[PDB]
Amino acid sequence: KIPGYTYGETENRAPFNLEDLKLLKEAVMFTAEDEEYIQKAGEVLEDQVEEILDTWYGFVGSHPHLLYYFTSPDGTPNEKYLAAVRKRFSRWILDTSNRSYDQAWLDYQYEIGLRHHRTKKNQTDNVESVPNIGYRYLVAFIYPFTATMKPFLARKGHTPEEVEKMYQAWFKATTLQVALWSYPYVKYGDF
Amino acid sequence: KIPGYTYGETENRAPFNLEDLKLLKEAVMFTAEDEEYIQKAGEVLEDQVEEILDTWYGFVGSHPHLLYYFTSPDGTPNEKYLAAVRKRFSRWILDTSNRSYDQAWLDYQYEIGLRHHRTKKNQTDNVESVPNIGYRYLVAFIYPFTATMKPFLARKGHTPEEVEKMYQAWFKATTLQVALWSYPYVKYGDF
Ligand code: HEM
C-alpha cells in the first residue's frame, strides 16, 4: 500500500457534484478527445515518473520560499515528509491518467485540496510542518508543473502533434484539478 | 477615456506587495527573458486585438453557465455590460504586454480581482446582473485564455521558436495574474 493514499476511502463526500464537474470540464475545454490523450499520456509517462519528480523537487528545493512548505518548524526540510508525499504524488500522476473522473475521483480531489489547505495539512503523515500552503502558489504551480512536463511527453518517441495533444490534455487536467482544490480555500458561497 | 478603466487611479492599495510579486514570478518561472517576450507578443497582438475578443466572447457565449455572468435578472445578456467590459479587456491585453509589473500594475490586479468577486462586480458599469463569479471558473479560464492565444501569436510570421517564447511568457503572465485575482475569494490568511 501507499501510506496516506485513501482514494475511494475518504468517508467524507465532496461538496461539488458531477454536474458541477461537467460544467467545469466545459470551461476548461475538456472533451472525450481529451480523455483519450490523458491516458495515452499515462503510458508515455509511467516509467519516467521518478525522473519527473526529481525535476520537480529540484525546482521546489531550489527555492527557499517553496521548499518552505516541506520544512520542520526549525526550517530544515522534513525528509520523511518529502519522501512520503513523493509517493502519493507519483500515484496522482497515474491516477490523473487512469481514473474515471467520477464521484470517488471528485471525493479525492476534495481530499487533496483539504491536504494542501490548513484543514488537513500535515495530518496524513503525522509530520509537524507549516500549517497552510498559501493558495497563490497552487495556482502558480499550474505553470511549472505543465511546463516541466513537456519534454517528458516527447522523450518516448512521439510526433509533435501526438505530443501537443497529450500536453494539452495534461494542461487542462492540471487546471481543472487545481480549480477544484481551491474549494476549501474559498470563502463559503464564492466558489 | 475608457469608462471604468482606473489603472493607476484605484485609490485602493493592493494587499500583496512587490516582494510577493518577485516570489510569485519565481513560482511561475517568470524572468527578465519573459519581460522581453511578452513585450514582443504585444507588437504581434496589437492589431489583432479585436478578433481575439471575438474568439473569446464566442467561447463565453456558447455556454449558458458562462454567459450567465453577463446576464440581466431575466436571464438575457446585458449588452451594455458586455460592451463596457470588452473595452477594458482590450486594454488589459495591451497592459500585460506593455506595463512594467510594478506597484501600479499590482494595484490594478487587486482591482480587477475585486470586480470579478462579489465585492465590486457590477458596480463599475452600474448594472443589474449576477452577484459573484465563482472562483472555480477564474482558474479554469487560464486554459482557454492561454490556448486561444497561441494561433494569434503565429499569424504575424514568426519562428516556432519566437512563437513558443511569446506563448510561454503569456501562459506565465496569465497564471500569475489569475493567482493574484484570487485574493478577495480566499479566506483571510490562506492566500
Ligand atoms: C500544480 C499544482 C500542484 C499539484 C498538481 C500538486 C500535487 C500534489 C499531490 C498529488 C499531492 C499528494 C496527494 C495525496 O496526498 O494523495 C500533493 C501534496 C503536497 N504538495 Fe502539492 N501540488 C500542487 C501545488 C503545490 C504547491 C504550490 C506546493 C508548495 C510547495 C505543494 C506542496 C505540497 C505539500 C507540502 C504536500 C503534502 C500535503 C499534506 O500534508 O497532505 N503543492 N501535491
Ligand code: HEM
Ligand atoms: C483567464 C481568466 C480571466 C481573465 C484573463 C479575465 C480578464 C478580465 C478583464 C481584463 C476584465 C476587465 C477588468 C477591468 O475592468 O479593468 C474582466 C472583467 C470581467 N470578466 Fe473576466 N477574466 C477571466 C475570468 C473570467 C471568467 C471565468 C468569467 C466568467 C464568465 C469572466 C467574466 C467577466 C465579467 C462578468 C467581468 C466584469 C466584472 C465587473 O462587473 O466589473 N472573467 N475580466
